[PDB]
Short mmCIF file of N, CA and C in Angstrom, two decimals:
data_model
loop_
_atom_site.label_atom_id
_atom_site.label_comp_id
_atom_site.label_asym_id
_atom_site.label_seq_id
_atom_site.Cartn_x
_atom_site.Cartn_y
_atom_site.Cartn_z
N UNK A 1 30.37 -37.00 -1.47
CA UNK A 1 30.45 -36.06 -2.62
C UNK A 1 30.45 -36.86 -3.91
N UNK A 2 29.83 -35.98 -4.63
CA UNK A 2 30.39 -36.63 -6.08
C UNK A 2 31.30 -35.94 -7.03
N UNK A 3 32.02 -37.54 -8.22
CA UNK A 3 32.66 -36.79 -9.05
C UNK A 3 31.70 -36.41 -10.35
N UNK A 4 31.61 -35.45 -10.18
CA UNK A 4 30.73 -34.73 -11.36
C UNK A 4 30.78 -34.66 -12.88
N UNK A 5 30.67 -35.43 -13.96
CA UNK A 5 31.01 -35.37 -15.52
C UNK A 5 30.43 -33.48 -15.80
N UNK A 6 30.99 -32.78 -15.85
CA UNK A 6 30.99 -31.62 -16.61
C UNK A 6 31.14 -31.35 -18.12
N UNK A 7 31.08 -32.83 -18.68
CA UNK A 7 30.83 -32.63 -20.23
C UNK A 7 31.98 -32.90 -20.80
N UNK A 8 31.64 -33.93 -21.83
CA UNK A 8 33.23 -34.65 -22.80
C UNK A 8 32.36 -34.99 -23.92
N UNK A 9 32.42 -34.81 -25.07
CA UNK A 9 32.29 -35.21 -26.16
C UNK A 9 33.04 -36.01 -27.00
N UNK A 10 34.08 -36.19 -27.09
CA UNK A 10 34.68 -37.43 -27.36
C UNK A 10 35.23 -38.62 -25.99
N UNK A 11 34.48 -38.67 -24.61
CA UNK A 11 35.05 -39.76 -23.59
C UNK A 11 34.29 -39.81 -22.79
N UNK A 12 34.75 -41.06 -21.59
CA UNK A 12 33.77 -40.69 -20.54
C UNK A 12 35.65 -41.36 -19.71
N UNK A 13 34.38 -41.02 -18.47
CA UNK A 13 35.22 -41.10 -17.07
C UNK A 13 34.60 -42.31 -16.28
N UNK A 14 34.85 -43.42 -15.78
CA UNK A 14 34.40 -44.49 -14.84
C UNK A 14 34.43 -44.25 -13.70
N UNK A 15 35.97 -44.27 -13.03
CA UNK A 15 36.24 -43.89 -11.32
C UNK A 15 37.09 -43.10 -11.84
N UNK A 16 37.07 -42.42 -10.14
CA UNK A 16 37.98 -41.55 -9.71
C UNK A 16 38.73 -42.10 -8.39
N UNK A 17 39.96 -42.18 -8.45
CA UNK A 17 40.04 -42.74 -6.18
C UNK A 17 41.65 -40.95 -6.06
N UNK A 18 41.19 -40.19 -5.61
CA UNK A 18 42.46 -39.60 -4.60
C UNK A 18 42.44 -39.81 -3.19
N UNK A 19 43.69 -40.22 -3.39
CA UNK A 19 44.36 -40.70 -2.20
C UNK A 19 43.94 -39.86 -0.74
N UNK A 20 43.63 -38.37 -0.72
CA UNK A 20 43.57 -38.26 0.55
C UNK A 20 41.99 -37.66 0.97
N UNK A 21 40.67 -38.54 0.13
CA UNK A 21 39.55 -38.41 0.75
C UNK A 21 38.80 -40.09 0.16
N UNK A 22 37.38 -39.31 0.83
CA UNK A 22 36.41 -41.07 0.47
C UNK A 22 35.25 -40.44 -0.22
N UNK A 23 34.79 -40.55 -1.08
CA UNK A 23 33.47 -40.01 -1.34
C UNK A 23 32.37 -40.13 -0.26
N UNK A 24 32.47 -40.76 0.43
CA UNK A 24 31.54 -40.63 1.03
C UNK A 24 31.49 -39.35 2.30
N UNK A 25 32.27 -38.58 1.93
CA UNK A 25 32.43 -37.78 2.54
C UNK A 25 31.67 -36.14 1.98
N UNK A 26 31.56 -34.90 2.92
CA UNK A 26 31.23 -33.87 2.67
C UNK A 26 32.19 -33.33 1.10
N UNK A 27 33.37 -33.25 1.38
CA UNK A 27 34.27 -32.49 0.39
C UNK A 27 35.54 -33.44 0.14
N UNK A 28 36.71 -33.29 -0.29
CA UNK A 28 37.68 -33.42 -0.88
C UNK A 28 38.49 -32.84 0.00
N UNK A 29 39.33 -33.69 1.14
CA UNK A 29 40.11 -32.85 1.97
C UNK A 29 41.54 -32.68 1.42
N UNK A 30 42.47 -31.67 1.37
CA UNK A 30 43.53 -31.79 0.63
C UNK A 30 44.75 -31.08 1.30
N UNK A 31 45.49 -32.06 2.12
CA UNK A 31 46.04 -31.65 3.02
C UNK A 31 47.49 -31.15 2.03
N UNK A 32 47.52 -29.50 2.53
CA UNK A 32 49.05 -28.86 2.27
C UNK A 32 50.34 -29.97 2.74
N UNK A 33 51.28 -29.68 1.70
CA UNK A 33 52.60 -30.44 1.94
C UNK A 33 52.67 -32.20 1.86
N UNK A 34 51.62 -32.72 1.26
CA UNK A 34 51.95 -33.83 1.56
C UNK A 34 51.74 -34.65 0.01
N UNK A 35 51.94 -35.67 -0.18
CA UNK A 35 51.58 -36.10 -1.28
C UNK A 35 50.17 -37.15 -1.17
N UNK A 36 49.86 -35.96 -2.73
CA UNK A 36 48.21 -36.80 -2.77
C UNK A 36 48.34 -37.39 -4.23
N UNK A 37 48.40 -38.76 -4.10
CA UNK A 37 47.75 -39.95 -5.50
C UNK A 37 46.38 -39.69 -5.73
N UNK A 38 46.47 -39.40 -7.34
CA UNK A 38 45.78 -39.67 -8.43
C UNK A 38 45.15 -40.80 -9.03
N UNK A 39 43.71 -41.13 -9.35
CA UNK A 39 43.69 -42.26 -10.47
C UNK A 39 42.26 -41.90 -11.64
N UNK A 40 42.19 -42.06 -12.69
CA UNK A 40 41.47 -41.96 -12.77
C UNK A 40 41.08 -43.08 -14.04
N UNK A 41 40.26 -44.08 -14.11
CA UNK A 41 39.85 -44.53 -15.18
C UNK A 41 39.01 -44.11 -16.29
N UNK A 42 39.55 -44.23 -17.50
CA UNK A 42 38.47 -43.61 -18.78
C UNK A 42 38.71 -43.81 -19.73
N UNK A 43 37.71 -43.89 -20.93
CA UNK A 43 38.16 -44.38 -22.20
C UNK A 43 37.34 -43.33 -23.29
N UNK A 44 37.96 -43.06 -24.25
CA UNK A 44 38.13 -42.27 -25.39
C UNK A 44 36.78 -43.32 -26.12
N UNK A 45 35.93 -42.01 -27.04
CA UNK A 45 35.05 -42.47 -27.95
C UNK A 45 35.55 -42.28 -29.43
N UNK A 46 36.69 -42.01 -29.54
CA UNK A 46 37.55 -41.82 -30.85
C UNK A 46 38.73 -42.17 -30.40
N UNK A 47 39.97 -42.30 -31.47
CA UNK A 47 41.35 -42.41 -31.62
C UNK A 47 41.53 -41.18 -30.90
N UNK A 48 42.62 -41.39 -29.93
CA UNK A 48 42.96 -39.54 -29.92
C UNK A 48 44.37 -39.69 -29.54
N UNK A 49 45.43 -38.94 -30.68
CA UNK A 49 46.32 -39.02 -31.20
C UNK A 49 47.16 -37.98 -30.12
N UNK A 50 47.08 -37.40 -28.91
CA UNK A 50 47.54 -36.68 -28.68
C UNK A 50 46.85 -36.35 -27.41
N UNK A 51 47.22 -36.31 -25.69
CA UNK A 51 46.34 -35.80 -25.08
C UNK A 51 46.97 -34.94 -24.24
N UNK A 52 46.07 -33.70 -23.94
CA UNK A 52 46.33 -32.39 -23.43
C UNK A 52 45.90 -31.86 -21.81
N UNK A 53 46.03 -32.18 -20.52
CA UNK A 53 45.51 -31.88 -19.09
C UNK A 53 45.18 -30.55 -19.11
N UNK A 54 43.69 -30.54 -18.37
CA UNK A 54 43.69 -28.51 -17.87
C UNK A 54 43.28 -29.24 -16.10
N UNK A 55 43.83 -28.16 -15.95
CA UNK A 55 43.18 -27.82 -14.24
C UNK A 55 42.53 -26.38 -14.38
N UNK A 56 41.51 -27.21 -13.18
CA UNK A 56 40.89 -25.18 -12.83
C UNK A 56 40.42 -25.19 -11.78
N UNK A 57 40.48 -24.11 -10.67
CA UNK A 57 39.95 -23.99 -9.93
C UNK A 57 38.68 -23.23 -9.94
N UNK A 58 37.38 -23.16 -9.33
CA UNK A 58 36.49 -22.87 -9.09
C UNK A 58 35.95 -22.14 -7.95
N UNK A 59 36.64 -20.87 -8.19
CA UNK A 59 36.43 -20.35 -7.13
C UNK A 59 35.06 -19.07 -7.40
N UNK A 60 33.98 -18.53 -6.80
CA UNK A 60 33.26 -18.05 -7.39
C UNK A 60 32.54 -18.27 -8.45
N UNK A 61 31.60 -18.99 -8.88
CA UNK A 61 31.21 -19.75 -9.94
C UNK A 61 32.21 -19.65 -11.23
N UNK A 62 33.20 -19.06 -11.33
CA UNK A 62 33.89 -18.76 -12.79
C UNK A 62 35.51 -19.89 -12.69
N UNK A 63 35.66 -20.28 -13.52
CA UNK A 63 37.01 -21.52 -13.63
C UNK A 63 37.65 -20.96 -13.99
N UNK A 64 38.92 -21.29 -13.10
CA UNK A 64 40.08 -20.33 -13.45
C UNK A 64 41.41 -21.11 -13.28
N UNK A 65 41.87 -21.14 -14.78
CA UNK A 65 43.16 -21.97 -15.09
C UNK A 65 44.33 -21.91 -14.13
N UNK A 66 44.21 -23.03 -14.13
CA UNK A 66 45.70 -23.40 -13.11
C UNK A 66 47.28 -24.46 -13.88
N UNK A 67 48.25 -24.37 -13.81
CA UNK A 67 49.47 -24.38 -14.66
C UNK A 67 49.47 -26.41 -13.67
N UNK A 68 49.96 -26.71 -15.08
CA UNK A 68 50.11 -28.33 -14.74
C UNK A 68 51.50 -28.55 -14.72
N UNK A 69 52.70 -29.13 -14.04
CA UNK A 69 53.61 -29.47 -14.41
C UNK A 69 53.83 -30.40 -15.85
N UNK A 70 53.09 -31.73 -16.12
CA UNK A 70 53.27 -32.16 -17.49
C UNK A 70 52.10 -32.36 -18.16
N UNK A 71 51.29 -31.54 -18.44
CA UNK A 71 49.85 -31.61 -19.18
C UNK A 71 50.05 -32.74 -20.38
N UNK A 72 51.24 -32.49 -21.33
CA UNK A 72 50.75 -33.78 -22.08
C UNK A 72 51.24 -34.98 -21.70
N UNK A 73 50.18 -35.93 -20.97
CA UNK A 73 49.64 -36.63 -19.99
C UNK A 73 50.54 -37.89 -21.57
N UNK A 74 50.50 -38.27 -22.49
CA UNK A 74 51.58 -39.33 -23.58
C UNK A 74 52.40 -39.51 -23.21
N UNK A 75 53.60 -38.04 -22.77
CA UNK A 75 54.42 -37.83 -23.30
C UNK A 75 54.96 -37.97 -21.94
N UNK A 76 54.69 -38.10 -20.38
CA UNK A 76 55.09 -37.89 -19.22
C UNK A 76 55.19 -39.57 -19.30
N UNK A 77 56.45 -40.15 -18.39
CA UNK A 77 56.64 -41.78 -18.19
C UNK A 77 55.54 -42.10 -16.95
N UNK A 78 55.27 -41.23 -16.14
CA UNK A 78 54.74 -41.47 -14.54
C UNK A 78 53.43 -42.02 -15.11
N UNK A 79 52.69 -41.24 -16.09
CA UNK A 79 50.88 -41.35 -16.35
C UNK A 79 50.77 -42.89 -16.05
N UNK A 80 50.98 -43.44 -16.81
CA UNK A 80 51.08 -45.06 -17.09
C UNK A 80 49.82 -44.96 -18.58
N UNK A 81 50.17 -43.94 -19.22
CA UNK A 81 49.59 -43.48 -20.50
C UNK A 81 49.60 -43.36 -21.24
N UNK A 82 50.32 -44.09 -22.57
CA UNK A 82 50.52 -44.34 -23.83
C UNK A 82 49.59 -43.64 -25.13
N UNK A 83 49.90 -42.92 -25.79
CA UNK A 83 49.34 -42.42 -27.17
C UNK A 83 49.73 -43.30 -28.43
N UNK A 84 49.01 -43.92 -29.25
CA UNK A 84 47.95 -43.72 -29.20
C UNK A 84 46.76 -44.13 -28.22
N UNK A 85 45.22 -43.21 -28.02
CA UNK A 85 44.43 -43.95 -27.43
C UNK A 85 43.59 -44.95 -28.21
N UNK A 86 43.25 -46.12 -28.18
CA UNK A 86 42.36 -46.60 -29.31
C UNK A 86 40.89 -46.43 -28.31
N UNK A 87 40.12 -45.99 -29.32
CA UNK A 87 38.77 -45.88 -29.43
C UNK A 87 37.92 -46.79 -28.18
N UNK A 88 37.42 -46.42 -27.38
CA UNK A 88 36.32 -47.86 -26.89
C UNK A 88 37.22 -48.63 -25.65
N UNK A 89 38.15 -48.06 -25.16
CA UNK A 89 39.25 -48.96 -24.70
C UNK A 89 39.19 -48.46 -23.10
N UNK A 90 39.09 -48.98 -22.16
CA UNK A 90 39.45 -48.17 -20.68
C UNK A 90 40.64 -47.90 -20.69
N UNK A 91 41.20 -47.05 -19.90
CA UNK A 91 42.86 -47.60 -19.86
C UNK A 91 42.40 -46.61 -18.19
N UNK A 92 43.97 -46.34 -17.46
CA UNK A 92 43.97 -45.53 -16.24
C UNK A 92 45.05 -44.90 -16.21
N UNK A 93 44.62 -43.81 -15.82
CA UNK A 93 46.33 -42.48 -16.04
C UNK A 93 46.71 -42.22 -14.47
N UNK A 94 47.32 -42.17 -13.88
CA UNK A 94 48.14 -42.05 -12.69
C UNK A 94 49.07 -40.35 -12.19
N UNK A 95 48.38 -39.91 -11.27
CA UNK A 95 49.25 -38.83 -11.53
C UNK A 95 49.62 -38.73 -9.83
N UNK A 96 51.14 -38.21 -9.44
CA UNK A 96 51.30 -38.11 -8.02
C UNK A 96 51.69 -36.39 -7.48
N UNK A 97 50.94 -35.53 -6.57
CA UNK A 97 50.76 -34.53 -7.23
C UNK A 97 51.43 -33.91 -5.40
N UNK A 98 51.83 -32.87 -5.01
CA UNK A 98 52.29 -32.29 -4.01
C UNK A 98 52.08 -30.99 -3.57
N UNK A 99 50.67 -30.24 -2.66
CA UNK A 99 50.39 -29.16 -2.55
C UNK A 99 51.36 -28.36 -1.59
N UNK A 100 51.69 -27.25 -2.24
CA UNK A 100 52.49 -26.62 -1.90
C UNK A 100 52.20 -25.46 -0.56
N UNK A 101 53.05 -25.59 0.09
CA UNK A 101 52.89 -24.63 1.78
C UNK A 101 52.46 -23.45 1.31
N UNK A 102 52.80 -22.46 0.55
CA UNK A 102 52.27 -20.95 0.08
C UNK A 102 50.77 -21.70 -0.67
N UNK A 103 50.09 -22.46 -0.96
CA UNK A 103 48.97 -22.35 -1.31
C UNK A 103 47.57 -22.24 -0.04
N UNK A 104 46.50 -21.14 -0.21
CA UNK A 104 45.69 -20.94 0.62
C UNK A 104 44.96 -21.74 1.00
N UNK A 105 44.20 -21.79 2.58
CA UNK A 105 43.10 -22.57 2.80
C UNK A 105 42.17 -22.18 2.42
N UNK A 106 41.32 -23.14 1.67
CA UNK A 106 40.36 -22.58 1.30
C UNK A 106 38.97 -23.69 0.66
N UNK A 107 37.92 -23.73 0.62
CA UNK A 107 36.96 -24.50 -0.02
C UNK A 107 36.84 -23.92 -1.37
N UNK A 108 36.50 -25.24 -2.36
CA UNK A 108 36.96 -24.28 -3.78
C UNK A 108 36.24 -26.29 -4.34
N UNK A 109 35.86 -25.82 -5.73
CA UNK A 109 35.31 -26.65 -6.71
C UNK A 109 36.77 -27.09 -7.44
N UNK A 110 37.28 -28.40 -7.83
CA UNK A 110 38.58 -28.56 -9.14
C UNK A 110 37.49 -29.35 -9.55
N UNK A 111 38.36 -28.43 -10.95
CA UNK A 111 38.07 -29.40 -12.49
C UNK A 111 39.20 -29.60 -13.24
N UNK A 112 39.69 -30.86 -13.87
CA UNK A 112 40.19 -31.35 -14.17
C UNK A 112 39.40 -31.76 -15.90
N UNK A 113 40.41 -31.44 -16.79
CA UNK A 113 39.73 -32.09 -18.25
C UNK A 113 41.41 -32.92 -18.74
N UNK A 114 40.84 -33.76 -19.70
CA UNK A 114 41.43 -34.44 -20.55
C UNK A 114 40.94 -33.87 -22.19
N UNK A 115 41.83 -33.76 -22.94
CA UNK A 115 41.67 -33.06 -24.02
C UNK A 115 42.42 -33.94 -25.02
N UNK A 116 41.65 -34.04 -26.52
CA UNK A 116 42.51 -34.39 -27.52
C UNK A 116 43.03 -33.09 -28.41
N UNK A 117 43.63 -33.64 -29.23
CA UNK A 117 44.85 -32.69 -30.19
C UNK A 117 43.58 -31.61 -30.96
N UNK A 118 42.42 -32.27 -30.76
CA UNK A 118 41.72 -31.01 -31.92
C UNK A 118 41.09 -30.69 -30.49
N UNK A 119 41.58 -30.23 -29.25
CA UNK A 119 41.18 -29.40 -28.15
C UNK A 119 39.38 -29.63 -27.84
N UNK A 120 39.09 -31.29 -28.08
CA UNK A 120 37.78 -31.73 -27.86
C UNK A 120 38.20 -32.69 -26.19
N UNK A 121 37.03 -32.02 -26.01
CA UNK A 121 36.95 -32.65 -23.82
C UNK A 121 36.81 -34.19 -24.30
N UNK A 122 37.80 -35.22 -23.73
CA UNK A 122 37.90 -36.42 -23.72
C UNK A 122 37.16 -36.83 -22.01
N UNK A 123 37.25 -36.13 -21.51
CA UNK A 123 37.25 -36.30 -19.97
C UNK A 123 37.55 -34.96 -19.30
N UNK A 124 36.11 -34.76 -18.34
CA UNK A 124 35.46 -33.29 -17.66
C UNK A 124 34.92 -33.62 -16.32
N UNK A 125 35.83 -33.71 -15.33
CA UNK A 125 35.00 -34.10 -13.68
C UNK A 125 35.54 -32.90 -12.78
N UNK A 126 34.44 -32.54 -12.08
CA UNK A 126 34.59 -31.72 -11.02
C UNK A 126 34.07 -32.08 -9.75
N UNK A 127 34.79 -31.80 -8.41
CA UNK A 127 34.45 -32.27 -7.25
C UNK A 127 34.76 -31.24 -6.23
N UNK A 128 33.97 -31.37 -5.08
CA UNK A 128 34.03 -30.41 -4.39
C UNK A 128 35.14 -30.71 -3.32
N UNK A 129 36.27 -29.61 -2.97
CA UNK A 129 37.42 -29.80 -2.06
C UNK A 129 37.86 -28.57 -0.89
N UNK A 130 38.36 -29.25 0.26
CA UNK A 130 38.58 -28.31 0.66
C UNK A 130 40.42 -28.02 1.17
N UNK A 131 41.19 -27.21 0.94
CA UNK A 131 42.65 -27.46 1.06
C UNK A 131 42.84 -26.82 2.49
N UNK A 132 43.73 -27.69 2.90
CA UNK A 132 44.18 -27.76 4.80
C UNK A 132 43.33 -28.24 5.26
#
């Protein structure tokens, strides 16, 4: 599979590694109850003074917001993510994330954005997954 750039105007995205698939695989397996590591490398094409996480799921071609425990990705100690970003710079944000038993099985598209303070896509990847 691939991780897909869905569009950033101020960033890009390098790698992606979660912990519980390989790209070289069909989908994104995402096993309920367990913990799945995050990584993602990327660097900002501006200063960005402030950064904001969305999730969405993709279910039926239409994206549909999903609630982050600490979206501003600065301000959380775990990211390994410091604000300011300077311009031109890689850095890597870290997130350790735990799917919950009441969530459905199901095949489904996530997208994931990185956002600065004036709500411009720093970072836009989507990949195809399947949960259980």
């Amino acid at each position: 599979f691939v991780f897909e750039d869905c569009g950033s105007e101020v960033g890009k995205f390098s790698d992606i590694i979660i912990s519980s698939c390989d790209p070289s695989e069909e989908k994104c397996s995402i096993i309920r109850e367990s913990e799945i590591h995050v990584s993602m490398k990327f660097t900002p094409s501006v200063d960005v003074k402030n950064v904001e996480a969305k999730a969405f799921g993709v279910l039926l071609d239409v994206p549909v917001p999903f609630p982050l425990k600490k979206p501003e990705i600065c301000k959380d100690p775990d990211s390994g993510v410091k604000c300011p970003l300077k311009k031109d710079v890689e850095i890597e944000y870290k997130v350790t994330f735990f799917v919950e038993k009441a969530t459905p099985a199901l095949s489904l598209e996530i997208m994931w954005e990185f956002r600065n303070e004036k709500d411009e896509k720093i970072t836009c990847v989507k990949f195809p997954a399947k949960i259980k």
